[PDB]
Design a protein around this nucleic acid. Structure first.
Lengths: 149, 186, 129, 82, 151
RNA sequence: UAAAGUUGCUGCAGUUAAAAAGCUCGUAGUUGGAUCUCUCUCGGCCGAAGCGUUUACUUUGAAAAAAUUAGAGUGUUCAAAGCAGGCCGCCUGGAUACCGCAGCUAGGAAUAAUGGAAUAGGACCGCGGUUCUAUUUUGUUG
């Protein structure tokens, strides 16, 4: 079930058994790498890059063509973002909720949802600090987190 | 050219190298075989009277070998008539680390160096033109495991006659009995 | 969330055998599940089983021959010495004539009689009879 | 009922199941080569695309995102791969 | 650095540092021998102990303490005294009625010689038992293994 | 104390008999998915070292007062006991087991935790560069 909801949804991707490059796909691994570089330079997160490559260029899975994952490729080329995109989007959502709550002080539902969002933020940040992805002194403070956005 | 990793060439290895040099000098694919190389080769009985030629190839070249493996295997089968030919990448298995291993490991053994991964890759490469589409390990009452491999329907009758030498080669270099079959539902 | 995949597998086998079914599906598969199943099968309690290999975590289709009364797991995996084995047998097994306690020992996964033969102890995985 | 058995065919009972609940999971989607009548080259489009993709040589809306499978424009001939 | 930060003179008591100097006795260098000893049990004398200048009479390598008895291990949890740290030993205690365990810990104030610089919180220390050094200290840090995460 | 599975670790209950917090979040605690199979002086490949990756577990070996308990021998007239006694000077016992946890030790390596190589200040390999270096001067050292 969801971490912060009573939902028990099942909807997710189902990878095919075959791990090979599709026969239709004629892009070399380096071609996919350069397309990834271009999309990252455009200002896109790895999830967006994967979605675009799947929808338009027919790249069913970048890991199966290049032997590497999109975030690893971005890091190896040196153009990966400062903090992971899931944590970034969680902080962005928290910032939006706080901005809404500043001008709507009677919204208890917004306060409850903000509590849930910040709990998720803290859990993800602790995990990232454990993996040395974030500096050990990193902390999410709700005073200037809009700069992190 | 044959360059064994332990620099120990053999007479059969020499004959296979001579045949490959022959394809190197004049063939429709002479541009590729000049820069390519094989680590070893050997023959084995597979049951009855048929024979199989396992051509051991360095890993970095395997993909390139797989670019032209169909024509190469066709011509080498023609040169040897009734002995089937299979290209397998030369892969080493780093032993599972123990508490008593004197001096065999200084860095983490990669998962690609493990016995399970190496045997899976051997099974994948042994059947190259036909892609594996499923595996079933049936455990018999005596405890022995029989692997059933489902092969793609795009290339079935081109390698249907190969289902016999494939099991023989896998028994020879892996020790596991395996059956190869083709499913009706893709 | 699910811990103890072996508990799930054993409960599934038990529930299927109590309904009189001929096969049971087990997911996910694991090495411990396969060894426990092999121990069960060597004593004629289940029969042949097939390991379906998907690229994430396999499944097992276990053929059931209705000779199984109860296959169960013991959580936590208590450490069992050769002295405590008799007390565990009295607690778990329905008779001294049949039934097996499965242990994981440094010599592998084996029933309690085989652990007495090799003069070894270990951790209790479960039981079947 | 006697799973994974060839004696009783079940292509129809397997592609009816949920994709995750199958014996071996497999996607319900596909990639398709699309020709635009005004265009002259292939475009490989995902069936459940989430992007408004355009022709690689023009500015024509090939498909639009929907709740599930993407909706293709008229006249564009689409054929599944594999 | 000045090793004379005390009201009394700090020196190694077994080293004579004012043997007479003459023209032949000084040729551009004063020289100062360093007393150090090899403690037993396979522990190797750290380089900074041999080539250092600190004065520590409780140091196992250059001081006046004999390592005999228990050789234990711990995790550094506090470094806030002078030449002393607090390590934490974590163990499991077996309750027999329930056939189960419970987490327990004990803090240990152990002497850390100036020969171990760059010791962090979370580092593992092998300490050896010696004579009472203070009210609570009975163990001396013999070896330091850095926590996983060195890069 | 057992009966008391009416304190439930084994092993109890919690819709209505006594009982689930009004509801979420949340640190500690507890619990956590799959996955990795021939190296130091030798006069027996023929004495040895680990300098290498840690523990839990399990098995073993040391060490561990007696008395008590268990238990071997022994007709106290029997028995509780005792450590006696037996044979025609002699013969014989005064055993043995257990002794939990922690500590010590040595095999096993399933299970469970844990570790390395990801800006390579990574493994092996030979090269460029430094030292009184317990002798690289039976000759008084230089």
């Amino acid at each position: 079930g969801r971490m912060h909801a009573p939902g028990k949804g099942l909807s997710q991707s189902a990878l095919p058994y075959r791990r090979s490059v599709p026969t239709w796909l004629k892009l070399t691994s380096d071609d996919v790498k350069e397309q990834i570089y271009k999309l990252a330079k455009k200002g896109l997160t790895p999830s967006q890059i994967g979605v675009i490559l799947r929808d338009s260029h027919g790249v069913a899975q970048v890991r199966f063509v290049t032997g590497n994952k999109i975030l690893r490729i971005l890091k190896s080329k040196g153009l990966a973002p400062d903090l992971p995109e899931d944590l970034y989007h969680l902080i962005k959502k928290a910032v939006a909720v706080r901005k809404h709550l500043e001008r709507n002080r009677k919204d208890k539902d917004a306060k409850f949802r903000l509590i849930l969002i910040e709990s998720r933020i803290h859990r993800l940040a602790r995990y990232y600090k454990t993996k040395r992805v974030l500096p050990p002194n990193w902390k999410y403070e709700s005073s200037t987190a809009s700069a992190l956005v | 050219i044959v360059k064994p990793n332990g620099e120990k060439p053999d007479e059969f290895e020499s004959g296979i190298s001579q045949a490959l040099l022959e394809l190197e000098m004049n063939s429709d694919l002479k541009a590729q075989l000049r820069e390519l190389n094989i680590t070893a080769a050997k023959e084995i009985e597979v049951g009855g009277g048929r024979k199989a030629i396992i051509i051991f190839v360095p890993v970095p070249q395997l993909k390139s070998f797989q670019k032209i493996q169909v024509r190469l295997v066709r011509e080498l089968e023609k040169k040897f008539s009734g002995k089937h030919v299979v290209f397998i990448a030369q892969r080493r298995i780093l032993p599972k680390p123990t508490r008593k291993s004197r001096t065999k490991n200084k860095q983490k053994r990669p998962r690609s160096r493990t016995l399970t991964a190496v045997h899976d890759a051997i099974l994948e490469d042994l059947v190259f033109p036909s892609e594996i589409v499923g595996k079933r390990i049936r455990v018999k009452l005596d405890g022995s495991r029989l692997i059933k491999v489902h092969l793609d329907k795009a290339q079935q009758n081109n390698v249907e006659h190969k289902v016999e030498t494939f099991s023989g080669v896998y028994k020879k270099l892996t020790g596991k009995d395996v059956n190869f079959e083709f499913p009706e539902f893709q | 969330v699910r811990m103890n995949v072996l508990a799930d597998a054993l409960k599934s086998i038990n529930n299927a055998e109590k309904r009189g079914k001929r096969q049971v599906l087990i997911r996910p598969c694991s090495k411990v599940i396969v060894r426990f199943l092999t121990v069960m099968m060597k004593h004629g309690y289940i029969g042949e089983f097939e390991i379906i290999d998907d690229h994430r975590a396999g499944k097992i289709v276990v053929n059931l021959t209705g000779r199984l009364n109860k296959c169960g797991v013991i959580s936590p995996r208590f450490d069992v010495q050769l002295k405590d084995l008799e007390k565990w047998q009295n607690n778990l097994l329905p008779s001294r004539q049949f039934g097996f306690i499965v242990l994981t020992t440094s010599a592998g996964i084996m029933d309690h009689e085989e652990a007495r033969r090799k003069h070894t102890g270990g951790k209790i995985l479960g039981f079947f009879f | 009922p006697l799973a994974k058995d060839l004696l009783h065919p079940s292509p129809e009972e397997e592609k009816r199941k949920h994709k995750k609940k199958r014996l071996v999971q497999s996607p319900n989607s596909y990639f398709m080569d699309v020709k635009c009548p005004g265009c002259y080259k292939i475009t490989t489009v995902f069936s459940h695309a989430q992007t408004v993709v355009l022709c690689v040589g023009c500015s024509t809306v090939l498909c639009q995102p929907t709740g599930g499978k993407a909706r293709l424009t008229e006249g564009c001939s689409f054929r599944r791969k594999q | 650095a000045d090793i004379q930060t005390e009201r009394a003179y700090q020196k190694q008591p077994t080293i004579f540092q004012n043997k007479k100097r003459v023209l032949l006795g000084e040729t551009g260098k004063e020289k100062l021998p360093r007393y150090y000893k090899n403690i037993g049990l396979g522990f190797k004398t750290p380089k900074e102990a041999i080539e250092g200048t600190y004065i520590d009479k409780k140091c196992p390598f250059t001081g006046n303490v004999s390592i005999r008895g228990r050789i234990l291990s711990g995790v550094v949890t506090k470094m806030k005294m002078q030449r002393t740290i607090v390590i934490r030993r974590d163990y499991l205690h077996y309750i027999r009625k329930y056939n189960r365990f419970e987490k327990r810990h004990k803090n240990m104030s152990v002497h850390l010689s100036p020969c171990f610089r760059d010791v962090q919180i979370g580092d593992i220390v092998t300490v050896g038992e010696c004579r009472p050094l203070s009210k609570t200290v009975r163990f001396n840090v013999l070896k330091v293994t850095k926590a996983a995460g060195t890069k």
